[PDB]
């Protein structure tokens, strides 16, 4: 909602506060692959705000890390955890294509 209203600086501050790490100073290292939702939000925000290129590579990497999870961790019981993964990674694939 803050991003929609345009006061994007507050949104960026809130994201770095919740995430705990600020890649805007550490440009090279990848995003913290844990907590896919907050990183997805930060990625959408950084696409929108200024940078329109390195976002693509971050998406590539984040996808190849997310689909890496259940295929390399074939849980025999956790079936209610991978469905949200499927839906989220479908979202990110579509964003990838249209970008």
Swiss-Prot record:
Q: Which residues bind 1D-myo-inositol hexakisphosphate?
A: 4, 44, 91
Subcellular location(s): the record lists: Lysosome membrane; Endoplasmic reticulum membrane; Golgi apparatus membrane; Cell membrane
Changing residue 51 to H does what? In FCORD2; uncertain significance; somatic mutation
Name the organs or tissues of expression: Expressed in numerous tissues, with highest levels in testis.
Q: Where are the TPR repeats?
A: 1-35, 36-73
Q: Cystine bridges: which residues?
A: none
Task: Write out the PTM section of this UniProt entry.
Answer: Autophosphorylates when part of mTORC1 or mTORC2. Phosphorylation in the kinase domain modulates the interactions of MTOR with RPTOR and AKT1S1/PRAS40 and leads to increased intrinsic mTORC1 kinase activity.
This molecule's function is given as: Serine/threonine protein kinase which is a central regulator of cellular metabolism, growth and survival in response to hormones, growth factors, nutrients, energy and stress signals. MTOR directly or indirectly regulates the phosphorylation of at least 800 proteins. Functions as part of 2 structurally and functionally distinct signaling complexes mTORC1 and mTORC2 (mTOR complex 1 and 2).
User: Subunit structure, briefly?
Assistant: Part of the mechanistic target of rapamycin complex 1 (mTORC1) which contains MTOR, MLST8 and RPTOR. The mTORC1 complex is a 1 Md obligate dimer of two stoichiometric heterotetramers with overall dimensions of 290 A x 210 A x 135 A. It has a rhomboid shape and a central cavity, the dimeric interfaces are formed by interlocking interactions between the two MTOR and the two RPTOR subunits.
User: What does the record say about domains?
Assistant: The kinase domain (PI3K/PI4K) is intrinsically active but has a highly restricted catalytic center.
Q: Which family does it belong to?
A: Belongs to the PI3/PI4-kinase family.
- What disease association does UniProt give? Smith-Kingsmore syndrome: An autosomal dominant syndrome characterized by intellectual disability, macrocephaly, seizures, umbilical hernia, and facial dysmorphic features. Focal cortical dysplasia 2: A form of focal cortical dysplasia, a malformation of cortical development that results in medically refractory epilepsy in the pediatric population and in adults. FCORD2 is a severe form, with onset usually in childhood, characterized by disrupted cortical lamination and specific cytological abnormalities. It is classified in 2 subtypes: type IIA characterized by dysmorphic neurons and lack of balloon cells; type IIB with dysmorphic neurons and balloon cells.
Q: What is this protein called?
A: Serine/threonine-protein kinase mTOR
Organism equals Homo sapiens (Human)
Give the gene symbol.
MTOR
- Report the portion of the entire protein shown: 1659 to 1757 of 2549
């Amino acid at each position: 909602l803050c991003g929609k209203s345009g006061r994007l600086a507050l949104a960026h501050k809130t994201l770095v506060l919740l995430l705990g790490v600020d890649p805007s100073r550490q440009l090279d290292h990848p995003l913290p692959t844990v907590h896919p939702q907050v990183t997805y939000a930060y990625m959408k925000n950084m696409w929108k705000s200024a940078r329109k290129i390195d976002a693509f590579q971050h998406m590539q990497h984040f996808v190849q890390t997310m689909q890496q999870q259940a295929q390399h961790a074939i849980a025999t019981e956790d079936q209610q955890h991978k469905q949200e993964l499927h839906k989220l990674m479908a979202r990110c694939f579509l964003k990838l294509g249209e970008w």
